[PDB]
Amino acid sequence: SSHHHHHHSSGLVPRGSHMINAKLMQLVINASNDGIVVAEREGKDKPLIYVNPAFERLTGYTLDEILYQDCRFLQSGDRDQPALMAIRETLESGGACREILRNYRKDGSHFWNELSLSTVYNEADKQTYFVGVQKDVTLQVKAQQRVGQLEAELNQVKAELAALKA
Amino acid sequence: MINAKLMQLVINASNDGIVVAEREGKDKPLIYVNPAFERLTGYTLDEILYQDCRFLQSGDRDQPALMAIRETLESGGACREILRNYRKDGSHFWNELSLSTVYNEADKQTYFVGVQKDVTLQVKAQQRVGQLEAELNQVKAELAALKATS
Ligand SMILES: Cc1cc2nc3c(=O)[nH]c(=O)nc-3n(C[C@H](O)[C@H](O)[C@H](O)COP(=O)(O)O)c2cc1C
Ligand SMILES: Cc1cc2nc3c(=O)[nH]c(=O)nc-3n(C[C@H](O)[C@H](O)[C@H](O)COP(=O)(O)O)c2cc1C
Ligand code: NA
Numbered sequence: 001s002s003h004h005h006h007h008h009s010s011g012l013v014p015r016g017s018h019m020i021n022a023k024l025m026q027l028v029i030n031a032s033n034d035g036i037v038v039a040e041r042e043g044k045d046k047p048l049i050y051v052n053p054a055f056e057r058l059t060g061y062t063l064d065e066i067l068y069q070d071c072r073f074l075q076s077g078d079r080d081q082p083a084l085m086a087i088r089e090t091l092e093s094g095g096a097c098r099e100i101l102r103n104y105r106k107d108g109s110h111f112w113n114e115l116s117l118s119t120v121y122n123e124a125d126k127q128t129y130f131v132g133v134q135k136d137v138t139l140q141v142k143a144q145q146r147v148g149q150l151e152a153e154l155n156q157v158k159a160e161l162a163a164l165k166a
Numbered sequence: 167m168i169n170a171k172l173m174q175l176v177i178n179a180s181n182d183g184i185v186v187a188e189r190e191g192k193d194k195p196l197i198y199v200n201p202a203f204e205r206l207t208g209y210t211l212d213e214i215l216y217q218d219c220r221f222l223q224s225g226d227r228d229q230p231a232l233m234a235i236r237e238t239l240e241s242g243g244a245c246r247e248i249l250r251n252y253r254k255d256g257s258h259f260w261n262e263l264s265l266s267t268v269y270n271e272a273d274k275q276t277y278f279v280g281v282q283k284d285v286t287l288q289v290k291a292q293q294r295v296g297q298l299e300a301e302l303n304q305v306k307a308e309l310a311a312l313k314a315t316s
Contacts (some may be wrong), residue, residue, distance in 0.1 A: 009212070015178050016198045019186070020170045024270070025177060025198075028186050028279035031268035033244040038168060038176050050167040067167070096181040116283070120179035122172070131176040133281060135246075135264070143292045150298040157302065161309045164316075 035059075035134035037071070045070040046091065046130055058113075058134060060106030071132070074103040074113070087115065091130060094119045100141060112138040182281050183207070185219065189276040193218040194239070206261075206282060208254035219280070222251040222261070235265065239278060242267040248285060260286045 019025040029036055035055030039046040047068045056063060059074060075081065083099040090097040096118040103113040116133040177184055183203030187194040195216050204210060207222060223229070231247035238245040244266040251261040264281040 005212070014171075014174055015200070015211075016174055019198055020174050022273070023170060024186065024277065025173050026170060027270055028266075028268055028277055029173065029177065031266050032279050032281065033246060033264045033266040034182075034281045038172070050173070098181065116181045118179055118181040120176055122175060124171075129172070129176055131180050133180060133182045140288055140292075143295060144288075147291060147294050147298065150295065150302060154298060154302050154305065157305045157309060161305055161312065164309065164312055 035132075037132045037134065039071070039130040039132070041128060055134060058105075058136060059103065060109075062106070065106070075101065076104040078102055078104070087117065090117060091119060094121075094128075100137060111136045112141040182283055185280045185282070187219065187278040187280070189278075194278055203282060206284060207251070213254070223249065224252040224256075226250050226252070231263075235263065239265065239267055242269070242276075248289065258286075259284050260289045 014020070016025065030052050032052060032054055035058040036050075036052045037048050037055055038050035039048050047070055048066055049068070051063070051066050056066070059066070061074075072079075081101050083101050086097060087099050087101075096116075098114065098116045100112055100114050102110055104110050114135055114137040117130060119128055119130050121128050178200050180200060180202060183206040184198075184200050185196050185203055186198040187196050196214055196219055197216070199211060199214050204214070207214070229249045231249045234245055234247050244264075246262065246264045248260055248262050250258055252258055262283050262285040266279050267276065268279070269276050
């Protein structure tokens, strides 16, 4: 049994249009606990055109150091990171991904950054934009690193035990 | 930096489930969710909107993150907490809630913004660390006893 309302639902009107009229989305995204950023295309680069204060606190870098350049500067030259190829493929082909990179704050310290990215085509101006949600996942990556070394060491002991038996 | 029309487009299209709530007495009803949140929970926009997001607990209420969420939001802070949630089809997942509070001077209302993601594989992968360390000790001791017999 059910009591559903029998209305048609349209996709012609952008979802959450009341948030536009009340400027509510700008307010709450500026307040988010996660780093949130928006980029546009410019040749071989994807310069940032929006970042929120959580992203500045995350990176320690200032807004003018961040805005209007490609996010790759956070790699601080650590350009030999494997996740980069997966990120390029998503952003060039369209779609969504969640990928972890090493990044460096303004004060030199490092951290594990998890990039949750997607592309969105804008019918108005015919441009593709990109949106990213970022956060420090250092503790979670260290745990995953711990499982991997624990299994490599479990197999050494197991194999040495199996050999001494046989 | 960007206008509100573009902001709405990109938040609507985010990879992450993003919701906005408003203060309404003892509740914080949801006033916006994006399609990624519909995909994460299996509920539709009409099923989700205007109720408090606690329905995703399906009455699973002895969860320690609940006290932390309440204390944070009631004092206007931000938090990152994990709890058991249930999709529309009843399947369980660990949901990580990244929440923050903001007062709107224009309308004198308090709003909340949340980002949600599935961390089931990560919580279950973390639980392996302790299990592996205990098994590694057990096989090492079997080798130490066998090598003494040689
Ligand atoms: C929306 C968006 C956010 C991004 N955020 C980060 C980030 O926080 N840290 C990082 O190292 N790279 C980030 N990137 C990736 C770089 O901007 C760049 O795309 C990446 O380094 C691969 O591009 P490239 O190899 O051509 O330089 C982001 C990319 C996009 C589109
Ligand atoms: C913006 C926002 C998003 C939330 N998202 C979730 C969620 O995805 N899952 C969940 O179990 N609770 C979520 N909650 C928590 C509940 O709405 C509620 O605050 C929580 O259960 C503790 O309050 P209560 O004791 O009144 O239930 C969210 C809360 C806010 C403010
Ligand atoms: Na989250």
